[PDB]
Design a protein around this ligand. Structure first.
Ligand code: ATP
Ligand code: MG
Lengths: 338, 267
């Protein structure tokens, strides 16, 4: 009531975009690319299914890959804090919630529980994997299924079901060896199977380089946390997210359906220019989802070309950074207009 | 008490003796009774399809009521083999029947076997899973008094699925004047006893389902007929076991299959 009254004014405040982008995780310095990707992730797209036969997910999946010392874990802890229906898990097996559903007698209750996986428990929210590259074989198969169909199928004891897990995945990973390799592509930097990587939308490659100003500000921020522990506030952001997610269902009638097609012809030209990781219509669908998510960010109810511009920025930035060093620079200086 | 008249039992034995005669009509069971006589066997096997062909109403009575009709059948067989032979029928004290053929609604698996077929003759498919060590159950126990030099013989009966009181199953250990007895094991009679556990055949069970199993009881000339992992098909009587002396009953009646015949795969 007063909540809707106040957040309508905030939505009309004319800078709600950058405001929420900076509001995401105020306990962290830098990484505005991650901030924007995580805003789009928190809001998520809109599911669609022609008839009941062409299910395309409406979840913005973001993968945070890079060497240690970059607050990926802190980011995912914040996302667990801020998102409702937000569960937190790890590929090792240390977390109290696993990734593969099983049936067993629970220790405490002593009852024959069907412990559904973390993916199922994330049924209509966010599942936050950490150390994605170190997951085991069955964890790999389980997350593959939950990404592809959103339908985890148990067949173990006497149970035969294909119950549903429509969660947005927010992962974290480390490359081979613990220093990122710009010389090589993402697919062999990260050590995850390409079918698993293919089901992601934003690929935040968090490199780590020695920079005077960035190092000084990072160190000042950490010691700031220490001395103090010797935009929007969080509650308002949560309410805005909830209100947007409840009712706003943007639609893409008003979107430059010919500019995007021409631009994808341009991108496919630049991608066939090498043999590297190319562009495909999955990227079109991911960009559509990102545009719908920005529409839900502003509560516009209809995509505007500012929203499509921001979706183009995030997707092309992530794809260029995912491309190897030479092709990264080539595509950057080609498509620098966006 | 002793029954003097019983329309059901008398007509049952009459119809059975008529059916098992069979000499005037193709000699099927004349040949079978002569075969088991010559081969020194006493468990006849009877084609229920032929029984339906001859006396269909008798067949329905047999299927829908097992113990009574089977007791009538085995006694009719006793009289029939008594007619065809004297010393043989005297030697063997009770002549069993087993059933065989097609059992339309009653040819089931351990899954489809519900309580609807209680006290009836089922024909259960499925593998074997357990085979108990074969054991003799005492059926006619002879004792000798060392002091008195007189010999007695207590008797017993197949109270497997009927009412059973302690008097029947007492076994003597003292004489009427406190003169302890000595049992004569060799002079006694015995009946081997085994218990197997049929399970629904692993392919035929619906997938992802814990299988359904039914216990089976076996006696003389049926014990070592099927080892574990046998693709058996047991024809028998499905019944209830009485939970012994209560004072409080949950009404949960455990069930068994008293096997009247055992067969392997026909290959
Ligand atoms: N950009 C940053 N701004 C502020 N603090 C940071 C930043 N990057 C790292 N830190 C600090 O790094 C410390 C240790 O990092 P943290 O535990 O989050 O690991 P991580 O970089 O997410 O590691 P990994 O990806 O290997 O799990 C945390 O206290 C966090 O405060
Ligand atoms: Mg960590």
């Amino acid at each position: 009531d007063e909540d809707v009254k106040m957040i309508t004014s905030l939505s009309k405040d004319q800078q709600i975009g950058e405001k929420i982008f900076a509001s995401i995780a105020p306990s962290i310095y830098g990484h505005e690319d991650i901030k924007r990707g995580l805003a789009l992730a928190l809001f998520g797209g809109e599911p669609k299914n022609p008839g009941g036969k062409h299910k395309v997910r409406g979840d913005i999946n973001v993968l945070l890959c890079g060497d240690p010392g970059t607050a990926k874990s802190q980011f995912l802890k914040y996302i667990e804090k801020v998102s409702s229906r937000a569960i937190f898990t790890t590929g090792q097996g240390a977390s109290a919630v696993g990734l593969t559903a099983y049936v067993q007698r629970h220790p405490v209750s002593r009852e024959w529980t069907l412990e559904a996986g973390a993916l199922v428990l994330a049924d209509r929210g966010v599942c936050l994997i950490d150390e994605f590259d170190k997951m085991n074989d069955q964890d790999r198969t389980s997350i593959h299924e939950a990404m592809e169909q959103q339908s985890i199928s148990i067949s173990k004891a006497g149970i035969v079901t294909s119950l549903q897990a429509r969660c947005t995945v927010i992962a974290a990973a480390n490359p081979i060896g613990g220093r990122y390799d710009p010389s090589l592509t993402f697919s062999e930097n990260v050590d995850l199977t390409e079918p698993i990587i293919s089901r992601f939308d934003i690929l935040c490659v968090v490199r780590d380089t020695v920079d005077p100003v960035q190092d000084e500000m990072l160190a000042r921020f950490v010691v700031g946390s220490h001395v103090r522990h010797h935009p929007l506030p969080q509650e308002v952001l949560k309410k805005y997210i909830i209100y947007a997610k409840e009712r706003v269902h943007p639609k893409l009638n008003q979107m430059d359906q010919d500019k995007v097609a021409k631009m994808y012809s341009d991108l496919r030209k630049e991608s066939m220019a090498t043999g590297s990781i190319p562009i495909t219509v999955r990227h079109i669908e991911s960009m559509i989802r990102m545009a719908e998510a920005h529409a839900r960010i502003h509560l516009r109810d209809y995509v505007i070309e500012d929203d499509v511009n921001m979706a183009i920025r995030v997707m092309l930035e992530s794809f260029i950074d995912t491309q190897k060093f030479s092709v990264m620079r080539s595509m950057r200086k080609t498509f620098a207009r966006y | 008490t002793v029954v003097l008249d019983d329309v059901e039992l008398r007509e049952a034995q009459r119809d059975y003796l008529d059916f098992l005669d069979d000499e005037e009509d193709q000699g099927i069971y004349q040949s079978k009774v002569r075969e088991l006589i010559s081969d020194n066997q006493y468990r006849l096997i009877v084609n229920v399809n032929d029984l339906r062909r001859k006396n269909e109403k008798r067949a329905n009575r047999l299927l829908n009521n097992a113990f009574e009709e089977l007791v009538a059948f085995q006694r009719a067989l006793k009289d029939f083999v008594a007619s065809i032979d004297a010393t043989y029928a005297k030697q063997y004290e009770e002549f069993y029947v087993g059933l065989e053929g097609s059992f339309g609604s009653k040819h089931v698996s351990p899954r489809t076997l519900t309580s609807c077929f209680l006290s009836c003759v089922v024909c259960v498919e499925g593998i074997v899973t357990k085979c108990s060590l074969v054991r003799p159950k005492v059926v006619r126990s002879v004792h000798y008094c060392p002091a008195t030099k007189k010999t007695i013989e207590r008797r017993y009966s197949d109270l497997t699925t009927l009412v059973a009181f302690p008097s029947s199953s007492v076994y003597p250990t003292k004489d009427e004047e406190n003169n302890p007895l000595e049992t004569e094991y060799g002079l006694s009679v015995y009946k081997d006893h085994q218990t197997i556990t049929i399970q629904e055949m692993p392919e035929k069970a619906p997938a992802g389902q814990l299988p359904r199993s039914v216990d089976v009881i076996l006696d003389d000339d049926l014990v070592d007929k099927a080892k574990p992992g046998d693709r058996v098909q047991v024809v028998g009587t499905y019944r209830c076991l009485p939970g012994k002396k209560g004072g409080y009953t949950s009404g949960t009646f455990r069930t068994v299959l008293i096997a009247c015949n055992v067969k392997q795969m026909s290959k």
